Amino acid sequence: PKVILKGPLISQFNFREIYVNDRELLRVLVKIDSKKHLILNESNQLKSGILILINGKDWRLYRNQLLNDNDIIEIIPIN
């Protein structure tokens, strides 16, 4: 799947878009957030003020189902 960063996350991660082979959302986030811990707490739980869209829809609707290779994951910070 394709990961797109929005807002301050772009400068904080130092990239805007990246592809990852992971089909499990948590693993996608861990690969992105590996040595930085910017969007995940130590418990790998998402930090507050971060939303995730999968193909334009809130991630929680998907119930941790298999991601397809062509899915677009948007990570969006909010106030």
XYZ file of C-alpha atoms in Angstrom:
79
model
C 0.000 0.000 0.000
C 0.804 3.677 -0.467
C 1.213 5.903 2.599
C 0.627 9.651 2.278
C 1.613 12.044 5.073
C -0.261 15.309 5.642
C 0.417 18.519 7.542
C 3.415 18.782 9.906
C 4.045 15.026 9.628
C 5.602 15.669 6.219
C 8.437 17.778 7.634
C 8.664 15.681 10.810
C 9.215 12.446 8.855
C 11.071 14.233 6.022
C 9.040 12.631 3.233
C 5.525 12.969 1.800
C 4.694 9.613 0.219
C 6.109 6.117 0.491
C 5.092 2.594 -0.524
C 5.192 -0.292 1.965
C 4.638 -4.007 1.333
C 2.716 -4.595 4.577
C -0.923 -5.730 4.366
C -1.523 -5.212 8.101
C -2.187 -1.596 9.094
C -0.358 -1.803 12.420
C 2.716 -3.180 10.659
C 2.507 -0.391 8.079
C 2.559 2.162 10.893
C 5.383 0.403 12.744
C 7.514 0.351 9.583
C 6.862 4.057 9.020
C 7.267 5.030 12.680
C 10.061 2.550 13.428
C 12.895 4.556 15.004
C 11.003 7.828 15.384
C 7.932 7.134 17.545
C 6.170 10.172 16.095
C 2.704 8.676 15.503
C 2.783 5.611 17.783
C 3.107 5.475 21.562
C 5.493 2.904 23.044
C 2.485 0.574 23.214
C 2.108 0.941 19.419
C -1.248 2.633 20.049
C -1.935 5.643 17.823
C -1.269 9.023 19.399
C -4.132 11.476 19.769
C -4.562 14.093 17.062
C -3.728 11.541 14.365
C -6.341 10.218 11.951
C -5.888 7.521 9.326
C -7.832 7.252 6.089
C -7.786 4.117 3.970
C -8.982 4.999 0.470
C -10.626 8.106 1.904
C -12.449 6.354 4.761
C -11.703 6.196 8.498
C -9.431 3.250 9.316
C -11.641 1.946 12.122
C -14.341 1.000 9.600
C -12.010 -1.614 8.120
C -11.691 -3.735 11.273
C -8.041 -4.621 10.620
C -8.877 -6.463 7.405
C -6.201 -7.307 4.838
C -4.896 -4.255 3.034
C -4.693 -4.517 -0.747
C -1.486 -3.506 -2.530
C -3.215 -0.553 -4.210
C -4.748 0.905 -1.031
C -3.978 4.529 -0.190
C -3.284 5.256 3.474
C -3.413 8.915 4.531
C -1.978 9.870 7.918
C -3.436 13.206 8.987
C -2.641 15.260 12.094
C -5.421 17.364 13.670
C -5.692 19.913 16.483
